[PDB]
Amino acid sequence: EVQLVESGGGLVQPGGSLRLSCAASGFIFRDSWMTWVRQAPGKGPEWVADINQGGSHKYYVDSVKGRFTISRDDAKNSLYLQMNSLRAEDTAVYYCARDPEFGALDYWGQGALVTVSSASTKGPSVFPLAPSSKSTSGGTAALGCLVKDYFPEPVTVSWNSGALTSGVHTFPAVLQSSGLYSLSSVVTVPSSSLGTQTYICNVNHKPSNTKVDKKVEP
Amino acid sequence: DVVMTQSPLSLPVTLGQPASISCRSSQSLVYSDGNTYLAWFQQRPGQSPRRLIYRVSNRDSGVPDRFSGSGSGTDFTLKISRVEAEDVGVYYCLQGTHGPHTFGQGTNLEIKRTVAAPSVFIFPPSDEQLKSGTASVVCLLNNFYPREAKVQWKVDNALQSGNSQESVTEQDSKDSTYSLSSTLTLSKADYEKHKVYACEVTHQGLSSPVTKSFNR
């Protein structure tokens, strides 16, 4: 199975530097032309940089020429992107990808969000959305977690460490008037299972190294 | 740089019916080796892009023959013979003939389906939040279609304005529905001044506007 696992996303102020990494597996990395593309919020993909099999040819789009550096370590099956002198326009989800021929990218990483912004890092507050007669609809109950006042994106939410996925909706983050983000994650369960089954939301906000396990009770 | 222009910008389709997406380049995409390098990608909500078509008409190994690519020179078409629910999302063309490689702006494929009224849930603020000084009241609408819905907040039967925000999920990859959250934000002191908090929902699926209330 082919995997490309990226890391290093996060927040840096304008003029700063950040380093992304892309760890491959499942194919012969040394024999692959490799690529970085990015997607700005609400837009489509755009090229950033690529590197051929020996590392002898490095291409950069005009906007990042002289500020970004692409490199590879074949013995570690790793692709790197060193970003310097970052601008707000560089804010995007960055994807590493394998290029078999002429931009027809066939294997993609999971994405890494780079935010370029001067605002402070703020870890979220997690509040329960408790099930009650008012979160009942027929034979079903809704419960959730309110992940409030964090910066920057992203936060991830899972339920019972990933074992609970049916009926789950984690909403996209909302920009609040304060400039901080907020989101809710909710799950619909049979109301008969309340008081029997435990429900825990796992909130992760890496930029502030916040990992929370909040038990949501009726 | 080569300009890739896609049309339509949004395409409403019902399951089982065909769909067509066009893509135009500002230059010919014939490379000096005689091949034309045009690919199509699909981005499902909250996921990485995924390759469908390349070299104008080659289908990716994990992509069924329902998808087909066609065209020449600067005019290209992606066709889905029968649309499935998992086809929802944004589609991009990409030329690789010239450097830099350029993507289209995207075409949103939207699934039309039968009306589904929302289930409505309301949550009072938690006591942990109240200890901090602010009150959030959350109204939830789950698994509805179409997307258009009206959510009004009433505090002691007074209509609210300017103190609530909405978040809407993208159309689901399995059942093709939406979910929506509306959040009323108030100081603790303002929250403790009133008694009845109501979320009124207007949707085509409901038998009439629905209200979910609680007494603080």
Ligand SMILES: OC[C@H]1O[C@H](O[C@@H]2[C@@H](O)[C@H](O)O[C@H](CO)[C@@H]2O)[C@H](O)[C@@H](O)[C@H]1O
């Ligand atoms: O060297 C010119 C060209 O290199 C990269 O695109 C190449 C493509 O030309 C080659 O034939 O195929 C590989 C696939 O492995 C790459 O897609 C750059 O992306 C491009 O900007 C240009 O610089």
Ligand SMILES: [Cl-]
């Ligand atoms: Cl800034």
Ligand SMILES: [Cl-]
């Ligand atoms: Cl987020």
Ligand SMILES: [Cl-]
């Ligand atoms: Cl489950």
Ligand SMILES: [Cl-]
């Ligand atoms: Cl960070």
Ligand SMILES: [Cl-]
């Ligand atoms: Cl219509």
Ligand SMILES: [Cl-]
């Ligand atoms: Cl239907």
Ligand SMILES: [Cl-]
């Ligand atoms: Cl009720």
